Amino acid sequence: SESHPHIQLLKSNRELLVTHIRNTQCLVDNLLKNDYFSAEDAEIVCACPTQPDKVRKILDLVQSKGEEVSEFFLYLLQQLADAYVDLRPWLLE
């Protein structure tokens, strides 16, 4: 009840995500569009120099926003990872 499974998954996988996420633009934009991130959230993410710093900050914000947003963020990574996957063979050539 004070435990939240999709928050716990993001905490347990912080380094996995930080080190394997290559684009944060798609993520911030979709969080903004779905009213989960505010203009100020996205500015806080900009003020981050490096790409890993940005993932760290996105995860900290997502987590502090609670279970619904943490669940949405993971659903978002699933969708974005699936969006162009069937194309990859052709893209690779």
Place this chain on the structure above:
Amino acid sequence: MEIIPSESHPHIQLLKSNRELLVTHIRNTQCLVDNLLKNDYFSAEDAEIVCACPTQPDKVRKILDLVQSKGEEVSEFFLYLLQQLADAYVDLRPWLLE
């Protein structure tokens, strides 16, 4: 009848040859439009025209129509974008699938 080389554009041709492949296999047009906007290849107007298209396939057809009409540089950038987007979360796939 003469085929003038400077009037043929290989990245436009790649898109045209792959219309139905792209339409049937691209499942999110949102990250594409947003990147085309951010990079000023798409205008606010372009994104609104695509936004008005009901289905994913309808939006893909519109995006490809617009990209192709904008020419070789935009078409080349669009293919580069699909490559980057196809790679951005590929490493996470095993864990995401589970």
